[PDB]
Nucleic acid binder design. Structure first.
Lengths: 109, 75, 83, 97, 95, 83, 97, 95, 109
DNA sequence: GAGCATCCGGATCCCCTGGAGAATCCCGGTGCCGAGGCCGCTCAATTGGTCGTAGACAGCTCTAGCACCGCTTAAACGCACGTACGCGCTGTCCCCCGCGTTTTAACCGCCAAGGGGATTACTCCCTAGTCTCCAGGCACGTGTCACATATATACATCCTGTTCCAGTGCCGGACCC
DNA sequence: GGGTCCGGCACTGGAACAGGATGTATATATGTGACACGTGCCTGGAGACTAGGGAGTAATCCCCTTGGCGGTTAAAACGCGGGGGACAGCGCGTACGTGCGTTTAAGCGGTGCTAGAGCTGTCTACGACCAATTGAGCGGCCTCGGCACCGGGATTCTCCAGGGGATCCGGATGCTC
């Protein structure tokens, strides 16, 4: 008599695992309990952030004539957007490197 | 044609004749006021001042090379 | 068995190429030992934290998890080795 | 007469070369020996995962390269292109370290 | 066999299918994105715990998640995250 | 109620006195507008954080606890206001 | 002729005096008005308890004074006694904001 | 009618009288110290919470408190701190 | 009938309330489950830190020949120790001021 | 008739451009190995019912925060004299990139052997929970002495006069032609 | 007897030392209010017992880590050379420093009002927990085409070897004495 097992990400219209986030906050020990809307909200914001990052990453991959994204492309993505730069200023991508940046005094006349 | 720079520099050092020598910046501004393209002639004024001090017509007060202050001879 | 001089193992042109990655044009001679020293300080500060993590783990092996974790605590969290 | 480029032109070219690159710069075995050496003075008989010492390694050039654009800004601040350790001391003192 | 390692890989892959149907992703960057999801997750979770404690609230609600999303994310990311998350929770309450 | 031009309300000699606190020997006259700008930026950031804190609490009055709390999350912690 | 000290000596005496001093250094009411002035823009009708205003006062003074030892390090670095806005700007840049 | 607010005032006063019988304090510096105890407590306790969640231990132990103290406190403070703490916990277990 | 009341701080011989910090760790949700020795250990650590910072403040006040601690004394104490400076680098004390720091280039001659 | 002023043309040096080489960019080519997808499994998500409990709200008090007002100067500000740097430029010395050759140990790859990572089974030490009890810490009241403040001396310090030492330019003498 | 070269002296610039003004430090008097001590209380800490589980420890294996050995060469190391800056000095222009006066608005003291902070009581919405069960999520595995490496040809960058313009210098010319 139980209803058909559908997923909470599907009723949320989202693709990130909402139930897994709910579980990880439940055992993360950040409060004694969590409301229903909070893991949905956090899965939503994580999905938007990952969509932004990989949209810029795919555009950078098409920039480099490549259909496969390298962490170098993640550097070209995040380090060329100042708002994401403020989001992730203190982090470093392994095997990523730095953007090409030359000070104006360095080039010859 | 036009007179070369050396006569202009002699007039520049004779223009003020204060107790110390006349400086490089003061002679450049004197050439600018009298009328000269000081912008593209820095190597020219350096070689001219070195050439004239090598003859002893003008003597060096304090500096070394093109730096310092410049004043005319004993006589 | 024991080791005494590995700070010379971080060689001169490698430090130079790192300075190219930093965009540094020309590098003086006195630079090299200073970079060796600050490298030594940063490495000892992180590896002490890591070995305290392993001693908490009762584990005689340094793992990548505790390296990422100690760099996270030191304000320099690193992407690409978690998990 | 063999060709010889003016200094800095080459240097700018390998700046562009490794800066468009993404690979490792420091040799992994002498550095890994250094990691065992610096670990040795605290506890004996330590073992290292290869990925662990690699991750510590990109952490190493990460901190080093960041300190290097710090000192590069410090050096161009003083109207110079030559780096001196006094710039490094400045960068460490402003960084809080 | 073995005990499992929980991950966020195929979710990043299917979001890639949503935003860019043609391109691919390397495994190294995939581990980077698992680290990214864990890092932003723990930052938002920690700020949620602080905002819960600070008002003496012991329930994690959607509201302080909204405040912490505003608080950590700068500007445009924050406002678009609020819009998209409110859209998501309105669909969630509507089953 | 309306305030428009209190950004110049911080005086030039006040910035001189903060410079004396910082150990400045000679101060340029061109410094003052950018110090006012960075001062306004820092206050804008911290009170943005504070007003989000208080509108979470459904309060129209902000407290000193919220101030030290926002400065705690920025990494410029102060002490002594109920924190 | 009336007495007059040479420049900097009065300034250095001010350094000793005010660095020895512990009191609040900026004027209270105009800074409080400025905090309100910035405050209307994000949320209307915001009210302040006074101790919060002194807390913001000390926070602003601390952030500023730290930036000024930073720019003193920069001015010494460029062989100068004057700071110029690029000194402050590069202090901001190396602090990573 | 008021609500009593918890603090650590008399304990720091007792510590002062143990280290200096004849010295006083200001109330402002007393607020500095109460906030100091709260802040250092929050740092050490947050480190301990992280160390608990890392190795899948649901129980905070004095051992990982010791690791956290050796972690956050550099140098000489760490070895002193572990010294009084070990003798203190042995005294606690002895009575 | 029942045992005489004796606080656990006294049995430890320590001054900060071990019961209070134990309760605060219980309600901080920093763990699900809390051991007995950890609050005693934490209390002893905080007593050593407070003891050293107050003896430094007391010698600072005796230097300033004032009997009572002012936050100027506390700032001078916390900043003249390099190791506490490393422990408390990014903090400013209210009404603290700063150490006497004048650079040699600023001095005349 | 020749000494000097002047003009004009030729050597020379700096700037200004074309060509050779070379490092990288771009176009094929090949075989390879990470990746994407099938498949099997199994575990955490889901439903649903209950149970407790916690925050949202209504209402009521009361507190300091906002507003207004009147003196009362400390400071904000402006201006002017003045001195102390910022930096522009160049001279000079020197230190470090660049390129080549020789060396060397790094990388790879290939193989052996075992140390502890990690997982499982067990059984037990330890600690939340709860009821009850009672005493230390905090609101509250008060009293009181170190400290803020004011006032009278004393000394450092900092700038300046004054006084002596050194450079130097001009004047006097001596030599040489 | 003139021209030139050298030495001295007095005038001026630049250091050593005493002296006055002043700000800063020190000594002494005075009230005050914040530090400190005593009281009431009541809640937060504690003693005992119980349940239950997280975790310490034996065992095992395996696999991933460490040790060793041969080959190649890319990278390190060293040396020559040459060139680009580092930096000191000097000077000039300027840009604040500071010291006077002036305006004012911050600061202080006093008062009314209120709106929100905050505390208490309701109670309803909502989240936690748990039996049962399933479909998505991950390990394993297997193929393949995007891609890393390899090679060949253009293009752009660099640097250096020839031409043009400005300049300086020397010779011709006229003029005037």
């Amino acid at each position: 008599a139980r209803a058909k097992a559908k997923t909470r990400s599907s009723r949320a219209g989202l693709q990130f695992p909402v139930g897994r986030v709910h579980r990880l906050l439940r055992k993360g020990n950040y409060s004694e309990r969590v409301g229903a809307g909070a893991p949905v909200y956090l899965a939503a914001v994580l999905e938007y952030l990952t969509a932004e990052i990989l949209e810029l990453a795919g555009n950078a991959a098409r920039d480099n004539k490549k259909t496969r994204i390298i962490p170098r492309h993640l550097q070209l993505a995040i380090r060329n957007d100042e708002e994401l730069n403020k989001l992730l200023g203190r982090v470093t991508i392994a095997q990523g490197g730095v953007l090409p940046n030359i000070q104006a005094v360095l080039l010859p006349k | 044609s036009g007179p070369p720079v050396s006569e202009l520099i002699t007039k520049a050092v004779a223009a003020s004749k204060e107790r110390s020598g006349v400086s490089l910046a003061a002679l450049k501004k004197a050439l600018a006021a009298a009328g000269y393209d000081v912008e593209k002639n820095n190597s020219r004024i350096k070689l001219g001042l070195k050439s004239l001090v090598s003859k002893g017509t003008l003597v060096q007060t304090k500096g070394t090379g093109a730096s310092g202050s410049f004043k005319l001879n004993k006589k | 068995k024991v080791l005494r001089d590995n700070i010379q193992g971080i060689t001169k042109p490698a430090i130079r190429r790192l300075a190219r990655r930093g965009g540094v044009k020309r590098i003086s001679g006195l630079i090299y030992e200073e970079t060796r020293g600050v490298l030594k300080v940063f490495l000892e500060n992180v590896i002490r934290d890591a070995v305290t993590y392993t001693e908490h783990a009762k584990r005689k092996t340094v793992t990548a998890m505790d390296v990422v974790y100690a760099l996270k605590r030191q304000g320099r969290t690193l992407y690409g080795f978690g998990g | 007469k063999p060709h010889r480029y003016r200094p800095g032109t080459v240097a700018l070219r390998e700046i562009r070369r490794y800066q468009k690159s993404t690979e490792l710069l420091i040799r992994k075995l002498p550095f890994q020996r250094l990691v065992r050496e610096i670990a040795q003075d605290f506890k004996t008989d330590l073992r290292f995962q290869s990925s662990a010492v690699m991750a510590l390694q990109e952490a190493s050039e990460a901190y080093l390269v960041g300190l290097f654009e710090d000192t590069n800004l410090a050096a161009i601040h003083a109207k110079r292109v030559t780096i001196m350790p006094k710039d490094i001391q400045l960068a460490r003192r402003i960084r809080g370290e | 066999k073995r005990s499992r390692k929980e991950s966020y890989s195929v979710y990043v892959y299917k979001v890639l299918k949503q935003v860019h149907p043609d391109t691919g992703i390397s495994s190294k960057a995939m581990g980077i994105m698992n680290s990214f999801v864990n890092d932003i997750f723990e930052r938002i979770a920690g700020e949620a715990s602080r905002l819960a404690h600070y008002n003496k609230r012991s329930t994690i609600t959607s509201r302080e998640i909204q405040t912490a999303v505003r608080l950590l994310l700068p500007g445009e990311l924050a406002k678009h995250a609020v819009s998209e998350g409110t859209k998501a929770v309105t669909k969630y309450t509507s089953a």
